[PDB]
């Protein structure tokens, strides 16, 4: 037996504040990518990319894809200013 990557690692959300119409790289919403394997990849969950076209408080979900194929879902928040 062994611990799969999504059990070993503990990604934590970073709250970002961005301007209306800003781009959002999913990795930028994870606070501790230095505590996760550097070959992990980050993407927005389908249907859960924060929409920066309007200002307000938005929610999103980051998928953290680990090298062993397991995946962590991370709830994040994005403040959009106008
Ligand atoms: Na985890």
d(CA 23, CA 51): 9
Do the bridges between strand 16-19 and strand 56-65 make them parallel or antiparallel, or are there none, so unpaired? Answer: unpaired
Identify how the structure was determined: X-ray
The total number of residues written for the chain in this structure: 82
d(CA 19, CA 52): 8
Q: How far is CA 82 from the centre of its chain?
A: 23
What's the CA-to-centroid distance between 26 and ligand 1, angstroms?
A: 17
| Partner residues linked to 71 by β-bridges | 65
Tell me which residue of 38, 30, 11, 42 sits closest to 78, measured CA to CA. Answer: 30
d(CA 49, CA 3): 29
Residue 30 is part of which domain span?
Answer: 1-82
What's the CA-to-centroid distance between 76 and ligand 1, angstroms?
A: 15
d(CA 66, CA 70): 6
What's the CA-to-centroid distance between 7 and ligand 1, angstroms?
A: 5
d(CA 28, CA 14): 8
Specify the number of domains making up the chain: 1
What's the CA-to-centroid distance between 63 and ligand 1, angstroms?
A: 11
């Amino acid at each position: 037996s062994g611990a799969m990557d999504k059990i070993k690692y503990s990604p934590e959300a970073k709250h970002r504040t961005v301007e209306q119409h800003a781009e959002l790289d999913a990795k930028d919403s994870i606070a501790n990518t230095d505590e996760l394997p550097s070959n992990s990849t980050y993407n927005w969950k389908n249907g859960h990319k924060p929409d920066t076209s309007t200002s307000g408080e938005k929610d999103g979900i980051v998928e953290v894809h680990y090298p062993d194929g397991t995946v962590d879902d991370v709830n994040v928040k994005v403040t959009v200013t106008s």
